Amino acid sequence: MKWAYKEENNFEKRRAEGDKIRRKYPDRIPVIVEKAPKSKLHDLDKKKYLVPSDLTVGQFYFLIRKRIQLRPEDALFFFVNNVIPQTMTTMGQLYQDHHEEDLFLYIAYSDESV
Ligand SMILES: [Cl-]
């Protein structure tokens, strides 16, 4: 998978905003959300999210569902390093275990489970 946020912003600029957010906004998690390729869902205009660390993955599912006009009756899976996070996990625990060298957390969503 290729991320549009990396194709539009190099590491030096991504890292700079990451160091910036991590210092000035310590209780916030910089998350990059992008649709996985070969998926038939709606694409999100807003890719950069500044969610609080107390926010849970279940709550993040709800926020993303409202922006693609998807109902709970539809399939929606989050992937981080090809691993589906649990709903109880906080976005802060996701960041600590899964953030990249640019200090951003990358989440992909799809309608498939693979
Ligand atoms: Cl954006």
Span from the CA of 106 to the centroid of ligand 1 (angstroms): 13
Measured in angstroms, the resolution is: 2.6
Q: Which stretches does DSSP call E strand in the chain?
A: 28-35, 48-52, 77-79, 105-110
Range of the domain at 94: 4-110
Span from the CA of 46 to the centroid of ligand 1 (angstroms): 4
Cβ-Cβ contacts under 8 Å for 93 (sequence gap 6 or more): none
Span from the CA of 45 to the centroid of ligand 1 (angstroms): 6
The enclosing domain of 12 has a CATH number of: 3.10.20.90
Domain count, the chain: 1
Given a contact cutoff of 8 angstroms between Cβ atoms, the answer to whether 36 and 113 are in contact is no
Nearest to 48 by CA among 110, 6, 86, 96: 6
Span from the CA of 75 to the centroid of ligand 1 (angstroms): 24
- Determination approach: X-ray
Distance, in Å, from the CA atom of 32 to the CA atom of 49, rounded to the nearest integer, reads 6
Distance, in Å, from the CA atom of 71 to the CA atom of 3, rounded to the nearest integer, reads 25
Phi, psi of 72 (to 5 degrees): -60, -25
